[PDB]
RNA sequence: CGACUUUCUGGUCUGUAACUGACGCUGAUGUGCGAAAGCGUGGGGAUCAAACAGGAUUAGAUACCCUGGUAGUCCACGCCGUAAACGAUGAGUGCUAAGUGUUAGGGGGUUUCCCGCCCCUUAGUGCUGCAGCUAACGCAUUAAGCACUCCGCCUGGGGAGUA
RNA sequence: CCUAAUCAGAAAGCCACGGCUAACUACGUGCCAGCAGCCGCGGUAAUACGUAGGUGGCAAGCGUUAUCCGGAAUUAUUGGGCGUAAAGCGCGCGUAGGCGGUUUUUUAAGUCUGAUGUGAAAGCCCACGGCUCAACCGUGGAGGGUCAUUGGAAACUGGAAAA
RNA sequence: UUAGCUAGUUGGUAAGGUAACGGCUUACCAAGGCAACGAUGCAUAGCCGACCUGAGAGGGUGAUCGGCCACACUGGAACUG
């Protein structure tokens, strides 16, 4: 099913602390009805790292593949930017 | 003051009864911030007709039209009250059992205690209304005892 | 409701061809009279134009309403549907003395629509279209004696006394509808 | 107010409040529940009829009438017009009207087609006042 | 130009003095030509027949020029004074020129076809005929401009 | 801060206008140069003038006033302003008082006029309103 | 926020351009600081001072006119966090006639210190007033003129800041 | 639905008239009755009560009431203020966040700028067909995403980098 | 004048279980997991397409009709297919 891009999503790494599981969050912004300003909202991913070997801050791209547990939806598809003190 | 509304309650308890031959039960008035609303309940009949209000009040007004020993001009209010009465005495409670009554008593149901019965007949203490809650019928003995407010009803 | 005023009495009010004309109507009409407003005005308007056609709101807010569509004038467009309007191009040919007077004979009916049966005074009429004239009862005394008066058949009217019909031509104007009153004024009734 | 803060907010409006606590039958019987009915009218008895009076000049004697209707629910209720043949516990509609004779009510009742019957001597009541045409 | 006096009401102002209570019955009236000239006037008096007099006088002085095309504004403005500001906007034709009462007076004596226009603010008829009379004097046209700016009609133009 | 450079030109372009003189200067952009070119295109501002300096260097102005010093166009003003980035498409081209009251445009290029804009049809960030 | 002084700091600006290189922005929440009274506690109490009473006054008299005294005011911390804390003018930005001062600056020439003058701005605080705008009032380079990011309120009166 | 005939002959009224807003006078009435949506009228004299006329508006309907918006821009994004009618904590520090200086590239994220798929249908607007017509359905078109994708683009904001 | 919620809950482990999915549920171990950008709680509510007034902006509404969802005295089930 790879043809079928699945649900990517470029975003950091924010916890791990989970068993092989991780959690994305994903950043957008939706607007405003009346006015046309808004701010970044997003939507926090519960993610399966293979190995818990994601870590804050490591912008990283994943994958939904399955419903993996609790809103445990996306697997990790590559690790983007795993990063630590710069 | 009280005692002067007083002293009116019996200059113009004369008209009311030379009048309509009415008698006031009381005359009470309430205000806020402006000619107070003495409330003089006129009874005679129970079933005062409007007209037995206005010719009545008409009456009244004259007769105070001149005689208004408070320095102020006050509203009249005229009040022919109907049969719907708090039921404090047994006596109370023997002359509705024609109509419906609403008491609250010592036993509530559901947290409070009021609840609206119609009369079938007079058993002291004890009550055989057809009471109607929820739609609901049957002749329900409400213990005086139990009671803590007591009042005659509307019949609708 | 339909149409229930004596007219000339209305139009002793109105001022508005269909002694005391000169004049208002009733006790101190021919006597000093009230003058008037501009909103009055537009209500005259509104009258000098359909109490002149003889019609009802039902049947002519609507009519107003859908001028205000299509491109260019809007006043002018309903000076056109009151053209179109039925009862108003028959009387410009010649086959009434009044709007009053053919609206009776378009309700009853004795036109036809291109020789069918349209028994509504409230009927559209459209270029390449005409009437005709119930043959079964085409000769009656009034109906000949207004075609043998017809003072003119404008450029929309194409109509001659053995032609028993009149077919539209082109777009109408106030210039070629008679008795000019402010169309920007009626619009502006029917606005606020 | 700024934009961002324009945005966290709703700019609320200062929607009104019926000054005609109009809550019609509603729920009323079934299980009591309370229902915004906004219905024009509903059917119900004036338990109690009064008479306050007016002050000086015009000594135009007002009247008075406490009324239930299908929800039940008390107010003491003014009479406008002239003529009645109604009493105290008599079936009356009241309609939705605040004048200047007395506040702490806003409502009132109708005449013509209740017990509070109107009068058909007048041509006003020709279409309303409850009475018919007068013939 | 031929003078035509636009009168909106006839108020009386009581100048109550010591003693009598001195009204005067106080008028203002717009004189224009209705087309393309207008000038308001002002007048306080006792009568009908004086207030018009002494105001048609004030009006008919100062007067406009009411550029016009198709007897209609080439562009499109608002007037404003004193929060008795309105709006102003051509408007296609036999549609009609649409405005509240007063104004819609000022603006047909200003002689106008079809016009987009609303009363705003201040429902004071003598402040909303200023901010409209201020409007009004505040119009162009393109050549005006053609000139004024080196570039000409056709380029930048309505 | 100063927020907004359009703002600033804006503000004191009118200031300019009430106080009726022409030679005026002030720090630039390349897009305040280039706008000014556009003004000078337009007339209105019979000469303009880029040098450099810290930090951006100073633009230099001087209006065409009215034959009695007056203001050829009529009014100003800015529309992209913090907060606010508002773009317009190929359609979106707004038309104050049509052409005579004009508008540039930033575009997927650069920044370009409503006659431009309408023209080449390439929407963008309006920038301001002059008319 | 003014008796003097010091404490060990916080802030003020002229000029400065020193040069990383936007590091800035107001600021929900949060949140400190904070008239007076009041008050908890522990002291003081010098006044002052409610209440108070003696007491005019008048059955009554605290009502006030007395006499003294009075919680507390006053010292320690909290509670207090509230007010006319009002300009009911959020902040910063920069623009824009003038006249015309200030409070500190600086400069130029002017002259012995120009300190003496003038003028340019620095940064504020004036008065009159261009324009502008306000119902009016007036501000008007320190805008209430012009614009900009960021805060809060306001929604008739009042009901009731009260529940 | 249509034809043979039927007469003007069955078939229509109602609301208002102080004004606001279209339309008034006469009369009886008497600040009383009252009317009363607003100003308020009515005191004997009312075009504001009632009656008659007369007028207007309107009609197969009329008027009242219940509500939503227009109004009501009375949210003030469009389309309010806070100089005083309602509004600046009392005044802070600052988290997030809000917006973001000059110049040099890339990005295309936005942004713009098309192509794609895809916006049930109807209504929706337009045109048009039918129904006498209207009402009306119908027919097609238009409209209809802030959807996803790709073509450019790099002004701008946002990044990225360079100062 | 709704600020903490929160424990099969969090995640995995093995079983089972269903079309699948996983606390989905069991046993394990571990402590999570959400929480002002308003979870939670309360009221209330069928949903939208659609519709009404408004120039529009907007506001409001959600009759039939299109579909989607929930329910069928009440609760607890399960057979069937």
Redesign the pocket.
Same mark, same amino acid.
Request: proline share 4%; net charge positive.
């Given at each position: 099913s790879e043809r079928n891009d699945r649900k990517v999503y470029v975003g950091k790494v924010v916890?791990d602390?989970?068993?092989?599981?991780i959690?994305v969050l994903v950043e957008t912004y939706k607007?405003h009805? #009346?006015?046309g300003?808004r701010?970044?909202?997003?939507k926090?991913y519960?993610t399966?790292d293979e190995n818990n070997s994601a870590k804050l801050g490591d912008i990283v791209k994943i994958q939904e593949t399955?419903? #993996?547990?609790?809103?445990?939806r996306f697997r990790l598809v590559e690790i983007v930017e795993e990063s630590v003190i710069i | 003051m009280a005692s002067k509304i007083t002293e009116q309650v019996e200059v113009i308890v004369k008209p009311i009864m030379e009048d309509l031959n009415f008698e006031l039960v009381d005359v009470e008035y309430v205000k806020e911030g402006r000619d107070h609303f003495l409330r003089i309940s006129i009874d005679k009949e129970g079933g005062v007709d409007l007209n037995d209000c206005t010719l009545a009040s008409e009456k009244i007004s004259e007769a105070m039209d001149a005689n208004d020993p408070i320095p102020e001009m006050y509203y009249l209010d005229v009040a022919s009250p109907g049969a719907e009465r708090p039921i404090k005495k047994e006596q109370d409670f023997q002359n509705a059992i024609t109509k419906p009554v609403f008491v609250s008593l010592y036993v509530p149901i559901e947290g409070e205690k009021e609840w609206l019965g119609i009369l079938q007949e007079v058993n002291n203490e004890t009550i055989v209304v057809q009471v109607k809650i929820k739609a609901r019928t049957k002749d329900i003995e409400i213990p005086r005892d139990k009671i803590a407010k007591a009042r005659h009803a509307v019949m609708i | 409701?339909?149409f229930?005023?004596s007219n000339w009495?209305?139009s002793r009010?109105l001022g508005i061809s269909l002694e005391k004309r000169p004049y208002?109507?009733?006790?101190?009409?021919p006597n000093q009279?009230?003058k008037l407003?501009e909103?009055?005005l537009q209500?005259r308007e509104?009258?000098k134009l359909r109490?002149l056609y003889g019609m009802?709101?039902?049947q002519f807010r609507?009519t107003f309403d859908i001028a205000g569509?299509?491109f260019g004038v809007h006043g002018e467009n309903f000076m056109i549907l009151l053209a179109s309007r039925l009862d108003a191009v028959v009387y410009s040919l010649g086959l009434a003395r009044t709007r009053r007077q053919a609206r009776?004979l378009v309700n009853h009916?004795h036109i036809l629509?291109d020789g069918?049966?349209?028994?509504?005074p409230?009927?559209?009429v459209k270029p390449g279209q005409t009437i005709s004239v119930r043959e079964?009862s085409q000769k009656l005394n009034i109906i000949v004696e207004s075609v043998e008066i017809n003072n003119f058949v404008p450029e929309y009217l194409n109509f001659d006394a053995d032609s028993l019909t009149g077919t539209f031509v082109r777009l109408p104007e106030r210039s070629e509808l008679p008795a000019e009153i402010n169309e920007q004024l009626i619009v502006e009734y029917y606005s606020? | 107010?700024?934009?961002?803060?324009?945005v966290?907010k709703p700019? $609320?409006?200062?929607?009104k409040k019926?000054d005609?606590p109009?809550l019609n039958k509603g729920f009323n019987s079934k299980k009591k529940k309370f229902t915004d009915l906004?219905?024009? $009218?509903k059917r119900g008895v004036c338990t109690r009829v009064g008479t306050m009076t007016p002050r000086?000049?015009?000594?135009?004697?007002?009247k008075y009438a406490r009324v239930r209707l299908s929800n039940n629910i008390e107010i003491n209720a003014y009479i406008?017009?002239?003529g009645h043949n109604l009493q105290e516990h008599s079936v009356v509609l009241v309609?939705? *009207?605040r004048?200047?004779?007395l506040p702490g009510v806003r409502y009132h009742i109708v005449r013509g087609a209740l017990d509070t019957s109107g009068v058909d001597?007048?041509?006003? *009541?020709?279409?309303?006042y409850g009475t018919k045409?007068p013939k | 130009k031929e003078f035509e006096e636009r009168v909106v009401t006839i108020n009386r102002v009581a100048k109550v003095v010591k003693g009598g209570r001195r009204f005067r019955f106080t008028a203002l009236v717009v004189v224009g030509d209705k087309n393309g000239r207008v000038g308001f006037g002002t007048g306080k008096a006792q009568e009908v027949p004086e207030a018009i007099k002494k105001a048609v006088e004030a009006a008919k002085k100062d007067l406009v020029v009411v550029p016009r095309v198709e007897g209609t504004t080439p562009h499109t403005i608002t007037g404003?004074?004193?929060?008795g500001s309105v709006?102003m906007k051509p408007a296609a034709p036999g549609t009609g020129v649409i405005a509240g009462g007063p104004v819609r007076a000022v603006l047909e004596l200003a002689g106008i076809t079809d016009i987009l226009s609303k009363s705003?603010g201040s429902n004071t008829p003598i402040?909303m005929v200023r901010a409209t009379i201020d409007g009004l004097q505040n119009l162009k046209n393109a050549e005006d401009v053609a000139k004024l700016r080196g570039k000409t009609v056709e380029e930048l133009y309505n | 801060?100063?927020?907004?450079?359009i703002?600033?030109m804006?503000?004191?372009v009118?200031?300019?206008n009430?106080?009726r003189?022409e030679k005026?200067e002030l720090p630039? =952009?390349?897009?305040?140069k280039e706008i000014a070119e556009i003004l000078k295109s337009e007339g209105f501002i019979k000469n303009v003038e880029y040098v450099e300096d810290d930090?951006?260097g100073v633009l230099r102005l001087f209006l065409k006033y009215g034959q009695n010093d007056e203001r050829v166009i009529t009014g100003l003003?800015?529309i992209?302003?913090? /907060?606010?980035?508002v773009?317009?498409?190929? =359609?979106?081209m707004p038309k104050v008082l049509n052409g005579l009251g004009i508008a540039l445009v =930033?575009? =997927?290029? /650069?920044?370009i006029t409503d006659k431009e804009a309408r023209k080449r049809?390439? /929407? /963008?960030?309006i920038i301001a309103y002059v008319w």
């Amino acid at each position: 099913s790879e043809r079928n891009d699945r649900k990517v999503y470029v975003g950091k790494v924010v916890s791990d602390k989970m068993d092989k599981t991780i959690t994305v969050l994903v950043e957008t912004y939706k607007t405003h009805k #009346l006015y046309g300003k808004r701010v970044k909202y997003s939507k926090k991913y519960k993610t399966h790292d293979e190995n818990n070997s994601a870590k804050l801050g490591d912008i990283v791209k994943i994958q939904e593949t399955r419903p #993996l547990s609790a809103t445990k939806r996306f697997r990790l598809v590559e690790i983007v930017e795993e990063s630590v003190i710069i | 003051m009280a005692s002067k509304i007083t002293e009116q309650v019996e200059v113009i308890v004369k008209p009311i009864m030379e009048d309509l031959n009415f008698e006031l039960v009381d005359v009470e008035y309430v205000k806020e911030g402006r000619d107070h609303f003495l409330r003089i309940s006129i009874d005679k009949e129970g079933g005062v007709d409007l007209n037995d209000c206005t010719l009545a009040s008409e009456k009244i007004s004259e007769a105070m039209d001149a005689n208004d020993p408070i320095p102020e001009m006050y509203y009249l209010d005229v009040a022919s009250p109907g049969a719907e009465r708090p039921i404090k005495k047994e006596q109370d409670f023997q002359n509705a059992i024609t109509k419906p009554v609403f008491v609250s008593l010592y036993v509530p149901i559901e947290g409070e205690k009021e609840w609206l019965g119609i009369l079938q007949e007079v058993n002291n203490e004890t009550i055989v209304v057809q009471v109607k809650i929820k739609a609901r019928t049957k002749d329900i003995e409400i213990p005086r005892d139990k009671i803590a407010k007591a009042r005659h009803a509307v019949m609708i | 409701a339909r149409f229930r005023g004596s007219n000339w009495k209305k139009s002793r009010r109105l001022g508005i061809s269909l002694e005391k004309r000169p004049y208002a109507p009733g006790q101190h009409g021919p006597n000093q009279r009230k003058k008037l407003s501009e909103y009055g005005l537009q209500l005259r308007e509104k009258q000098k134009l359909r109490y002149l056609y003889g019609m009802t709101e039902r049947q002519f807010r609507n009519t107003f309403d859908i001028a205000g569509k299509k491109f260019g004038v809007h006043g002018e467009n309903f000076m056109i549907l009151l053209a179109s309007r039925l009862d108003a191009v028959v009387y410009s040919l010649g086959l009434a003395r009044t709007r009053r007077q053919a609206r009776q004979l378009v309700n009853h009916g004795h036109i036809l629509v291109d020789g069918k049966r349209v028994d509504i005074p409230s009927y559209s009429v459209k270029p390449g279209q005409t009437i005709s004239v119930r043959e079964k009862s085409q000769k009656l005394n009034i109906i000949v004696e207004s075609v043998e008066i017809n003072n003119f058949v404008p450029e929309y009217l194409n109509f001659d006394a053995d032609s028993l019909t009149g077919t539209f031509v082109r777009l109408p104007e106030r210039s070629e509808l008679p008795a000019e009153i402010n169309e920007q004024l009626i619009v502006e009734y029917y606005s606020r | 107010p700024t934009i961002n803060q324009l945005v966290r907010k709703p700019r $609320q409006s200062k929607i009104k409040k019926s000054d005609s606590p109009a809550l019609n039958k509603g729920f009323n019987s079934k299980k009591k529940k309370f229902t915004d009915l906004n219905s024009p $009218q509903k059917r119900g008895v004036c338990t109690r009829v009064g008479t306050m009076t007016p002050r000086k000049p015009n000594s135009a004697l007002r009247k008075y009438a406490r009324v239930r209707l299908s929800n039940n629910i008390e107010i003491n209720a003014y009479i406008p017009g002239i003529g009645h043949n109604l009493q105290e516990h008599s079936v009356v509609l009241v309609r939705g *009207g605040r004048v200047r004779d007395l506040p702490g009510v806003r409502y009132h009742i109708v005449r013509g087609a209740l017990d509070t019957s109107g009068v058909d001597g007048r041509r006003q *009541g020709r279409s309303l006042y409850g009475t018919k045409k007068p013939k | 130009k031929e003078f035509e006096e636009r009168v909106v009401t006839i108020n009386r102002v009581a100048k109550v003095v010591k003693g009598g209570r001195r009204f005067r019955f106080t008028a203002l009236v717009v004189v224009g030509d209705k087309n393309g000239r207008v000038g308001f006037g002002t007048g306080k008096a006792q009568e009908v027949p004086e207030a018009i007099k002494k105001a048609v006088e004030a009006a008919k002085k100062d007067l406009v020029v009411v550029p016009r095309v198709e007897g209609t504004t080439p562009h499109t403005i608002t007037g404003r004074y004193g929060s008795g500001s309105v709006f102003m906007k051509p408007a296609a034709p036999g549609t009609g020129v649409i405005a509240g009462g007063p104004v819609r007076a000022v603006l047909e004596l200003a002689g106008i076809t079809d016009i987009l226009s609303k009363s705003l603010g201040s429902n004071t008829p003598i402040n909303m005929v200023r901010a409209t009379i201020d409007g009004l004097q505040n119009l162009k046209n393109a050549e005006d401009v053609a000139k004024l700016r080196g570039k000409t009609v056709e380029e930048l133009y309505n | 801060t100063m927020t907004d450079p359009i703002a600033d030109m804006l503000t004191r372009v009118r200031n300019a206008n009430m106080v009726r003189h022409e030679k005026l200067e002030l720090p630039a =952009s390349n897009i305040k140069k280039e706008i000014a070119e556009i003004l000078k295109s337009e007339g209105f501002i019979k000469n303009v003038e880029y040098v450099e300096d810290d930090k951006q260097g100073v633009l230099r102005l001087f209006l065409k006033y009215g034959q009695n010093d007056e203001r050829v166009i009529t009014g100003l003003k800015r529309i992209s302003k913090p /907060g606010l980035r508002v773009y317009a498409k190929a =359609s979106e081209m707004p038309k104050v008082l049509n052409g005579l009251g004009i508008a540039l445009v =930033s575009t =997927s290029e /650069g920044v370009i006029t409503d006659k431009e804009a309408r023209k080449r049809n390439v /929407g /963008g960030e309006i920038i301001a309103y002059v008319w």
